[PDB]
Design a protein around this ligand. Sequence first.
Ligand SMILES: Nc1ncnc2c1ncn2[C@@H]1O[C@H](COP(=O)(O)OP(=O)(O)O)[C@@H](O)[C@H]1O
Ligand SMILES: Nc1ncnc2c1ncn2[C@@H]1O[C@H](COP(=O)(O)OP(=O)(O)O)[C@@H](O)[C@H]1O
Ligand SMILES: Nc1ncnc2c1ncn2[C@@H]1O[C@H](COP(=O)(O)OP(=O)(O)O)[C@@H](O)[C@H]1O
Lengths: 371, 371, 371, 56
Amino acid sequence: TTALVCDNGSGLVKAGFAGDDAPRAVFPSIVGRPRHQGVMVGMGQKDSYVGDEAQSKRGILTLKYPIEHGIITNWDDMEKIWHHTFYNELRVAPEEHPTLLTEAPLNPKANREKMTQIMFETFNVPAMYVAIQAVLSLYASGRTTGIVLDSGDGVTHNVPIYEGYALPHAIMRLDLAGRDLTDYLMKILTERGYSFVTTAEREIVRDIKEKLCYVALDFENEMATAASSSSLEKSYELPDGQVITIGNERFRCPETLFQPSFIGMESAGIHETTYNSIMKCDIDIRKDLYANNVLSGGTTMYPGIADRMQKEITALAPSTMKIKIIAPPERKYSVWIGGSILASLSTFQQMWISKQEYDEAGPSIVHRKCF
Amino acid sequence: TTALVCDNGSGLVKAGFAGDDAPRAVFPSIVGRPRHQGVMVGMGQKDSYVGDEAQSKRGILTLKYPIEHGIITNWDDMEKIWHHTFYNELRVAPEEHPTLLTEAPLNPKANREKMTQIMFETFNVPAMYVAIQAVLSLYASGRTTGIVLDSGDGVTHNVPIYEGYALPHAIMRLDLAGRDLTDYLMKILTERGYSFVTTAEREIVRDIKEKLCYVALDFENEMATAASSSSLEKSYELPDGQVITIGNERFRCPETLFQPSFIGMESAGIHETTYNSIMKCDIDIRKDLYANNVLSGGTTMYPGIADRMQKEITALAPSTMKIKIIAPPERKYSVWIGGSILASLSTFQQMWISKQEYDEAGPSIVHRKCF
Amino acid sequence: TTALVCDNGSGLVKAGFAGDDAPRAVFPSIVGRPRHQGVMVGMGQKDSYVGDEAQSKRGILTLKYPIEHGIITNWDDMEKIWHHTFYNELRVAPEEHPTLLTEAPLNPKANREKMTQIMFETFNVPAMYVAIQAVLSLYASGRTTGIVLDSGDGVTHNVPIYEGYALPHAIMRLDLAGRDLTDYLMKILTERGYSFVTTAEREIVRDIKEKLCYVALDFENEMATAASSSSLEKSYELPDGQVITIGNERFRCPETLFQPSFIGMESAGIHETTYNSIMKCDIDIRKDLYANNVLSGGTTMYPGIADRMQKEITALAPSTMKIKIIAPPERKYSVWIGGSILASLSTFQQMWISKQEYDEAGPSIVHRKCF
Amino acid sequence: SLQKKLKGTEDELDKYSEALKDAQEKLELAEKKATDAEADVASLNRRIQLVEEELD
Ligand SMILES: Nc1ncnc2c1ncn2[C@@H]1O[C@H](COP(=O)(O)OP(=O)(O)O)[C@@H](O)[C@H]1O
Ligand SMILES: Nc1ncnc2c1ncn2[C@@H]1O[C@H](COP(=O)(O)OP(=O)(O)O)[C@@H](O)[C@H]1O
Ligand SMILES: Nc1ncnc2c1ncn2[C@@H]1O[C@H](COP(=O)(O)OP(=O)(O)O)[C@@H](O)[C@H]1O
């Protein structure tokens, strides 16, 4: 039999089969409901659209995300998401397939327990397993040591691993990610008159971010370059027409990752939490960690982010070590790729949580050595 | 057939064949176990690393020494050490080779008896013999008289020998050695801010000691020189970067050998236990003993220790005798070299403890005239 | 003339006059700076708030600690702390008051040297003296022998003293303390759903710890009791309503003192380091040390710490001994009380360091006989 | 038409990468040599002071 690999993430569902090179179903993790009245009798319209259909009916729906920061907040919505993923995108019967789920470090425990309970009671899968996103990223990267920085859409986290041993006291988790970058871009785009307030203009702003934003290698020099020239100013065409022109806020948006004070957060940038995780690890694995700094997740896809991260970590660490940043082109799907590798490993077929184990030990069996 | 020569020591295993000029397997006498959880499934990692592999995986393991002061405290660990030595470093079958083991004077008797029992029951050797480290050092030195000072890593001892007769009432044993010097250096390095607490930072401190420490010919003058100048201050580069600078504690560390009150011990320095052993011997061999003062073992490898020892013993002994200190460059391996010489001697092939003798007389046969 | 006793500690400054029964001024050693912009013109607000004031404006400020683990890292805001202590809490001119300050064992030398340089040049005190915290704790406890465990907020140490003589080779120092317990509690509350990330929320977590945590007498039985019953849950009220309930976390937090592997340290618990510091001492005084085990400092204030530690040390020591744990109710002020006693002795008035003494011998005079 | 520009940039890039590699090689070489020479001179200098106090 084959196992499914559902990388829920927070803002993009990625599912597929264990043993493939890529997911076969990538769609947004949104659930939309109509907000207007509806006049044409016989239209027979539905009450809630899931996934990629909601993005077509944006102008009529209110789009809600069922996952805020890794954490699931709307369990009925999330159950709809899973039902859509199993039956409409993949077209499989979940009572014949083990399912490997992913989760971020340092989430509530009820999240994981309720996820297991759903997967066994509602969808009736034979086995299931919840994996950490950073470990799976390291599987897909081909390493066995290295400090991984998995910046998704809800959370950002560093997880240092050495020789296959993870150092839990050095795990860092930050709640700044692509969703906060989108909100900051919505906010600073009002300096030029453009206003995006609806829950469906957030998708337009996310598209603008993905297509035009980039990380500056030096922030003050790019500030001055934008103040003087106009060579970095680019245009974008809305779904309506009426092109908008983006100036220096092409690189002020992702700079929030290195200066979280822009959105009023207290914490330090990703370049500094990475270094603090290093310095919290031992002394005789720090050289390997410096040399194996692995990036994954969608928020690491900006142009120039690897070069910026290297410049910063190099200015932080001692001057005698080679600091190297691994940033594959298929970063966004690294967690899923690693999940497929892991679930196909023949050694892993004894780590599943079978259904009988659950029936006899309750949902608490998730936090056991299968953690 | 050939005999093996395993100089267990306390902190460095040295093994080889009888009839060679040097040991072919020198590795630390440590056994490491992982202390973190281990996340990558399929890693298939082991549960305990022995020898030189543990020093590579330092940052992940807890390193334990199975020999405290000559005495073996963890018999399972020591059995792992021996298994590694026989099968992985030397690649020999111990049921075809006699084995010569070494031990320090004035150890418990159960140490030696249990060692014999292990070597005959577990490893199944045909013969075995336990030798004293100082006697073997004197074999390797080419002498037949002389007072030998064998400062290893667990124990220090003087053993005066004259014309091949050892004087047991004049044997001295002190429990100050390289391990205590390492602990004292860890402690006094905190005066400059460097902190080494982990069981794997002790190895870094041992490296610092070996590479930078030296014995002062005069302690107050070097104290004043370090207080005034900076010409004796040297630097070292950790596995992490961040060089550390060592000042006057380059020579305060090995000065504990001549002033054991530094670590709160009651006893007297090595220069004074040597002289007390002399003065406890007869009156008409003291001139030869003064002239044949032999050093061996790793803790005698400091720069200037021979000159310091000579200055001290010369100020102690009467003014009319030539005091001479023999300190070869291959000091650290003298016990092993002498062991190889002894086991190759054709006269010695009748001093082995055969397996039938053991089977008929129990492990008590070790303390007989083969003592 | 009277002397000032300033037990600057690490996390609480306790000051007062020598000869009083308790410290007069007790406030957190915190320097806060505003992180937002400030709009109301005429507010005339200041740049940095110190001490107890900074906890009122805690929501606007970003709080720094000038002392990390006993050691002083930031010196400018430490001068700010001292200035606030002298002029705003005590209202005394330090030009006519000798000052007694405390420090933990096994600290850098530059700490003391800069401390006295500042106290003589910036504040112009006529005399000063730096004392060890454990000795003052023994003074206040009224013993003259006994092994004292002084768990503050940055550092934990054992100092065995017999008959008025301290045995420095048996002094242990551990960098696990109240701030590490606060960080572990922050990290462990996350699994229940609550997130505290800001330096202003670290103070709320410290309050939760102080008011709800306790040491379990039997850790496994308490874990089972929490996994079965619900009679352990207590509720706390955040500054904005939002009641939170904690179970396991009540005793899993201070258990880090007895199992430092919870926060990834390699060392042994406070009970085991106390026992090891006893076993480092001479065999004749271990009776009195076992019978006079003195606790002091804030981190020793959990309910059940004394009973737990007595149980542990009793199971470690031989069966013939009487183990006693001395834990006064005015425990967390013992260092200050002893400091006042000491500075109040007529025998002490010739052990200060004078102004001219310093002016002639430089700051190096701190380590010499005027200790 | 810009493809010639692209190719020329690739060529100068390759040249600069080879240059950087050679410079790193020479750098690490000379650095090992300087460190070893300093070790030798410090050792033998300490030995000189020892034989000086010996002469004294
Ligand atoms: N090329 C890109 N540049 C910048 N941001 C991107 C890019 N592609 C995707 N993103 C951001 O990544 C986020 C999705 O990351 P993803 O890896 O899907 O995490 P998750 O699966 O947890 O949602 C989106 O919010 C989007 O804004
Ligand atoms: N060059 C050196 N200078 C000072 N100490 C050394 C040197 N080389 C080795 N040592 C010390 O010698 C000890 C090992 O001595 P060794 O002869 O191996 O005894 P054993 O075999 O009983 O461990 C180590 O603890 C190390 O600290
Ligand atoms: N009742 C209590 N229970 C547990 N911990 C406490 C209690 N009161 C104070 N503490 C802890 O003690 C620490 C302060 O100890 P203290 O004696 O002030 O050391 P210092 O003077 O070096 O700051 C604080 O971090 C606090 O968390």
